[PDB]
Structures are given as structure tokens and as C-alpha cells.
């Protein structure tokens, strides 16, 4: 059974909120919870951060929140820190199904000297550590929401959505999939195919795995889920197993879906994209197709959605 959500008036707007709060006057939100998403063998920490915005900073799935960490801009004395953007990992109703909270999926950026391995905290990422170090009741300066690239196309409730994530790039897809499958949204009844491909370092680095596995058992004809574990698996050519290698295992199914009008999404660190492009080119070549021409048509048809960072 789908989970009741409120308030239904969040469905009424016909345009997404944008820049409701700006950097000079952010919204002072409050941390609800911070929890690690990863096991002890993960190379670094990734946390789920729940933020109470009280309904003052609503958003649509696929958008980002800005966070202004405290302190001074190290490059402009007297000025605030620059905004850092984070893909919202929750639906518009949020993890408490009430329209009052939104969630972030935040990897700690930690610096290690390339030769000695010595950590240097002064070179760690300011906003990501600020967020992962936060505790219930702490205040967060929120801006936005912002972004339109990753809004979910809902005009066809039976569309196909192929979602390609590495690491924290899973965030918008957690939101899409909760709206598609878990929440009782009477004006969006999804009857298409949602297919999540996720690449992470190892099993302990998986994010939200139990939630996604649950969708396989509840919606076996509408959801597919495939994972690539780069430090624990090898591809067919002998390289470390990346998300593009999982795509290749389903070369024919995914190309057929794209030809049929499927939307395809990419999110996570930008270093994910070169290997993906290389694989898609090789898959097309084996089929006797030009990947350049196919990608041009996907962009012209508004099927191609990329937000990497
Ligand atoms: C649209 C969008 C969505 C995003 N979504 C997410 C998301 O869902 N989750 C997420 O985790 N991130 C996400 N990001 C990235 C996020 O915005 C930040 O860039 C990231 O968290 C790092 O910010 P920071 O403040 O921690 O690091 P910063 O302080 O900005 O530092 C940047 C990097 O430089 C390194 N560094 C600092 N000083 C030195 C030095 N002297 N020498 C060498 N290295 C140094 C830091 O360790 C860090 O890796 C997103 C970005 C965009 C644009």
C-alpha cells in the first residue's frame, strides 16, 4: 500500500519553485537528523541529512538546495562563504510525508596527501564536513531551490526512465522512485518502467539499497535495479566494474528503450561521464549505429538529462 502524504496543495503549482531564498537572506532551517549510509569498508563517509524547512522552502523532485556554510569566504574577507548545491534526495513531501522536511545525501570530501596518505583537515571540503558533522537542532542556511535539468517529465505516466548514478548521484533518483512507487499521489500514477543503475566502490558503499531492493518485490513489472561495485567486481575486459559496464550487459534492452522514447538520466561526479560515453560509443558501433547521431537525436527529443559535478 502506498503511503499517505500531505499536503495535497503541493501538487497545485504548475511551475517549479526557483530561488525562493537567495544568499543575502537565506532561510534558517534546522537539522532533524544526520546518519551514516555506509559500512566500515567504504572508502569515505556518506550521510543522509534530514532538514526541517517548515514548508517555507518547497521544491520539486530533481531540484537542489543551496547551503551556505558558516564562516568567511577565504578569497573575499568580509564576505560569506559561497553556496554549495546538493541534489535533494527526498520527494516534495519529504521523509516524514508532511511537506516539512527535505533530505540530502552528502559525501565527506577529505584530503589525503597523495604520497604519504596523511590526512590534512585544513584541506577537507568545508560544506560537506559541516553537514556531516551536524547534529539535531543545528541551523542550516538554505537557499534555492534551484535547477530544472533533472525535473521528472510526468506528462506520460507510462514513460520509461533509465537512471544512471554513481555515489551521491543516487539522490534525485531516490526522490523519483519514492514518488513513482512509495507515496500515494493520486495525480501521478506511474505505470511505466523505472530502471536504476548504481555504481559505487563496494558493497559497504551502497546507498539506500534496502529501499531499492524493496521496490523489486513490490513493483516487479515496473522497476529494475542493477549495481556495479568498482573495487569488488571486474568487467568483461578486465577493468574495474563501473556503471557503464552494467549498461553494456543490457546493451540491447536499453538501446531498444531509448529508441522507444525512454528518458535517460546521469547524476554524480563528473568523472563518471567519459567512460559512459566510451561504452555507449562501442555499443552503438557493435550494432552498426553512430553514437554521435543517436546522442544528437536524444538531445533534440529532450530525452537526455545530465547533472554531474
Ligand atoms: C547541482 C549539484 C548537485 C550536487 N549534489 C551533491 C550531492 O547530492 N551530494 C554531494 O555530496 N555533493 C553534491 N554536489 C557537490 C557539492 O556542491 C560540493 O561541491 C561538495 O560537497 C564539496 O563541497 P565542500 O564545501 O565540501 O568542499 P570545498 O571546500 O568547496 O572544497 C572543494 C574540494 O577541494 C578540496 N580542497 C580544499 N582545499 C584544498 C587544497 N588546499 N588542496 C587540495 N584540495 C583542496 C576539498 O577537499 C574538496 O574536495 C553537487 C554539486 C552540484 C553543482
Numbering used by the authors: 1009 to 1317
Quote from the publication.
FNR is a flavoenzyme that contains a noncovalently bound flavin adenine dinucleotide (FAD) as a prosthetic group. It catalyzes redox reactions between Fd and NAD(P)H. The redox-active component is the isoalloxazine ring of FAD, which undergoes transitions among three states: fully oxidized (FAD), semiquinone (; partially reduced) and hydroquinone (FADH2; fully reduced). In root plastids, which lack PS I, R-FNR reduces nonphotosynthetic Fd by oxidizing NADPH from the oxidative pentose phosphate pathway.
The structure of R115A mutant FNR (mtFNR) was also determined in the oxidized form (mtFNRoxi) to examine the arrangement of water molecules around the FAD moiety. Although the space group of the mtFNRoxi crystals differed (P3121), the main-chain structure of mtFNRoxi was highly similar to those of wtFNRoxi and wtFNRred. Focusing on the water molecules surrounding FAD, the arrangement in the mtFNRoxi structure closely resembled that in wtFNRred. The R115A mutant (mtFNR) mimicked the dis­ordered side chain of wtFNRred, with its X-ray structure confirming that the water-molecule positions in mtFNRoxi resemble those in wtFNRred.
